[PDB]
Amino acid sequence: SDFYLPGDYLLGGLFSLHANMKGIVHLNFLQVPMCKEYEVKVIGYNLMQAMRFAVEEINNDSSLLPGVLLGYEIVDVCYISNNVQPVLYFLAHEDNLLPIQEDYSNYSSRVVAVIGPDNSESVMTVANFLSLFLLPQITYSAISDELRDKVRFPALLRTTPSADHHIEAMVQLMLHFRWNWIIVLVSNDTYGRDNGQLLGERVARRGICIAFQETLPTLQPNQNMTSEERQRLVTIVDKLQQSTARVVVVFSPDLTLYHFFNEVLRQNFTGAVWIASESWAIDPVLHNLTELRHLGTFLGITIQSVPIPGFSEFRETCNQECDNCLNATLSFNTILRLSGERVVYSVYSAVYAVAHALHSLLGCDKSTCTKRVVYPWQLLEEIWKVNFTLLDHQIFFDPQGDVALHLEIVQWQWDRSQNPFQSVASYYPLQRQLKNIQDISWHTINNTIPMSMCSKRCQSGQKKKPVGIHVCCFECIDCLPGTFLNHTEDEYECQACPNNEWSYQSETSCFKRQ
Amino acid sequence: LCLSQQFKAQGDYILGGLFPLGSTEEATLNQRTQPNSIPCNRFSPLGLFLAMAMKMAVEEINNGSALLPGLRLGYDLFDTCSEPVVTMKSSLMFLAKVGSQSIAAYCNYTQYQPRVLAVIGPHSSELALITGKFFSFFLMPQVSYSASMDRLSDRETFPSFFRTVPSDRVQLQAVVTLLQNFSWNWVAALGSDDDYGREGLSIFSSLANARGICIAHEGLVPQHDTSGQQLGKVLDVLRQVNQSKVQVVVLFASARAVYSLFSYSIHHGLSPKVWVASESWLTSDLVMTLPNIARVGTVLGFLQRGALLPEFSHYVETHLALAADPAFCASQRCPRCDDIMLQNLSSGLLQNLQLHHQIFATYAAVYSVAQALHNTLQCNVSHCHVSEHVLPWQLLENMYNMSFHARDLTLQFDAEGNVDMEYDLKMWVWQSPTPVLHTVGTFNGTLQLQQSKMYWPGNQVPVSQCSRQCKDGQVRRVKGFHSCCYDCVDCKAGSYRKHPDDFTCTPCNQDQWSPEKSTACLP
């Protein structure tokens, strides 16, 4: 099957080919959780084929690893379910026994590196093992900031910007279009609340008011809902429709949204700007509910596009098989083909980073490498130092373990035969700025920028007085005759005319009296 | 002394232990570059006492026939070293095959024997998460003597974690019941700028919103007095609380943080308030150093209660004396436990220890597993069905429904793994030159107050209500950190209120007129 290739050195892979939002985490009848039964996830299979393509190139290329067969072995981690055991499998000797030695400096696992899971909790659950062995791990899509503490996680690297930069991109997008008044929706798991609180700590200082925050229920798409969950969803949608804030930011796993949006459609809702976090800003499955085009404008922050030449043509000891993947992906293959690679590039660049690290560690020369016994902890030390161009892009690691790839904002477009997720703007983290915003097409009557603000700007001579806690909300009151609005010094209080002067009803200054 | 040899005992069934029995110096806090063993050469006293409590519990169980007749209960202990890597090494050791130092990566485990029956878990919530996600995969029952963080009660991610202490949610349920019973509906909340205080605020705000208590103001406080970033905020919150017109405030922080703020107040004459304290602050010794604390106002809080062991000190000293005998050898885990002498380990340390209840919780923990084994073997008064060797998941099957005894106290695990044990309510009297934490009630699921014993500075009950209802003629002007309450505004003459469910008054017409508070205009 696809899941194994022999070689002189093996990479480990952990991809979420199957997924369920409440999978079983423990041994089931004292047997490892069998991944096959949690439906299927085509995106994960795409990323797995990205890794396979990277390794095929690295073996085919006579220059990067001359005379060394780079192998791999893959295990699918069904979201948070079936962690642990893949790690024990990678770490154990060829007889599947892991000895508990006092010191591992001389130890030799199955694999020299792990292309780590796609999710923060899974990444931590694997890292707390691999840190023991200092066996290098590179994760392609886990954005949590906690993963930047090298003391806690010394073996962990990333090929994606941290959550800080996604939140900064969101807030700078809001500032550009002057959206002072927003709604935030979060899932009930750690991703949602962590990102929601992180956005909370950001939105306040820049001067944007979070109208309210709401926890989405963790529903399951292939499971019919109860009436109680339907009541909760109806309540959420009615909270949306009742509000003046028409900008909605969504922090949730992708699977929990299928029901949500369905209900949003059944409630005859329309007219809002939806801002998607990286978890679902790209989603072939959710994009296919084409009636979404009537809800409003769909924007999302995601990894930048980097077209991989020839990848789409290439795409044409338990938990190592998938029956559903091929027939499932053949239904999406067309809509996938038009979408340039974004996260696939994260996987591809991670594999190439390990490839260069190993190429250096073996003391290799373009004639041949000097094969040896690579203890993983040496390969980690070499991985920290790599620096090279892959496709016109320099990839190298921060002192804190991240690659400084750009972020990109994408609008969803429903005209087929062209890119489903079209670029609208580009964000640079090492400059921490959003730039090059292009022509977004809005749902509005004549394509005017949609707006959401708690208040209209007051007239001249009219001071503000706050309402509620939200600083964005205020009432406008005129400075009465004899007083005036010195807006150059204060917007919230008036000043009084000198003795020889007096002021009209609604003016910033005083006229000289009789 | 022979002390480190005494941390391993043979028996038919064996319990693992993780204790703060060692540590390492600041020099060891570097980023690692080679997987060498950690130098846990920095001794710590508390872990020794907790381990001795476990040893005493096992000795009691092995002496008396009341539990597990005819078979021996054993153990071997490892130190967490307060270090995730060392904790993980020990946890990996616990699950190795019987008689071998290696762990298997098999597909199934229907006939697989780990080398311990249960693990008495780590001392901290961080290590409790880190190890609970590992032990629960194998369905190994882990019983923690002190990990109060809420998240670990989740049966979905932690199907085998148990603890013999209440969670933070229980303490804050007690606090919210106190707030409800005196109708202190409008309050402020503070937390220390560490994970403890942020989690305290996270729990309290959710509980308060759920029960209709309205939070006027949320803030945080530093537990230091060393930087401008701390000084500015600690004075800022003091201004803001006064401006909110609040009278009752809850603080979830360590002692220093709170009295630091009070000290600043004492300098600049803050108004009196009612303060509700977490026990980590309510412990009064260092706080009473303030020379004019009477300016603060009433302070209340809840404190855990349990039957302390009456003979632990004698046992500790006796077995240390035995460990000093060179012949006792006829009877590494810690580089230095063998050399720390009796004199400096004398009773003064365990008398200084206010954490005496954690000595109980470590004791109770052992019994919970022992009883669970006693039930699992379906033991008679004088027999046990030892025909088969029990495995951890069969123990796990028997623990969610049990009741067990620890000295006079009796306990049960609930469906999410916590034990239920009561709290005292104590009020912080300063009026006597010798201050007193006077008991004024208890919480056992219902707040049994004893009203006649309450102290108030003016012999009057404080009140901090807010108007969640308004008159027919009044506008409901919203307020609060969340929009849960209103302050009523009388509708001014010349305007009409309309129906009271609407929220704004409107001018009357030219031919009309209206007095104050009118719903509609007269002609």
Residue numbers in the entry:
A (entry chain A): 25 to 340, 358 to 555
B (entry chain B): 23 to 353, 367 to 388, 392 to 561
What does the paper say about this structure?
Sugars and other sweet-tasting compounds are detected by the sweet taste receptor, a member of the class C GPCR family. The sweet receptor is a heterodimer composed of TAS1R2 and TAS1R3,3,4 two type 1 taste receptor family members that share the distinctive architecture of class C GPCRs: a large extracellular Venus flytrap (VFT) domain, responsible for ligand recognition; a cysteine-rich domain (CRD); and a seven-transmembrane (7TM) domain that mediates G protein coupling. Unlike other class C GPCRs, such as mGluR, CaSR and GABAB receptors, where agonists stabilize inter-subunit VFT interactions to promote activation, the sweet receptor is activated by the rearrangement of a TAS1R2 VFT loop, which destabilizes interactions between the lower VFT lobes and the VFT–CRD interfaces.
In the presence of sucralose, we observed a prominent ligand density in the TAS1R2 VFT domain, consistent with previous functional studies showing that sucralose binds exclusively to TAS1R2.3,12 The VFT LB1 and LB2 form a clamshell-like structure, and sucralose adopts a U-shape that fits snugly within the cleft between the lobes. Its chlorinated fructose and glucose rings are oriented nearly side by side, in a vertical arrangement, allowing multiple polar interactions with residues lining the interlobe pocket: the chlorine interacts with Asn143; the hydroxyl and chlorine groups participate in a H-bonding network with polar residues including Asp142, Asp278, and Glu302. Compared to the apo state, sucralose binding induces closure of the TAS1R2 VFT clamshell, with the bottom of LB2 lifting by up to 7 Å, reducing the clamshell opening from 112° (apo) to 105° (compact) and further to 103° (loose). The closure of the TAS1R2 VFT clamshell induced by sweetener binding leads to the formation of salt bridges between LB1 Lys65 and LB2 Asp278, which are brought into proximity in the compact state and engage further to form stable interactions in the loose state. In addition, a loop in TAS1R2 VFT LB1 (around residues 45–57), which is disordered in the apo and compact states, becomes ordered in the loose state and inserts into the interface between TAS1R2 and TAS1R3.
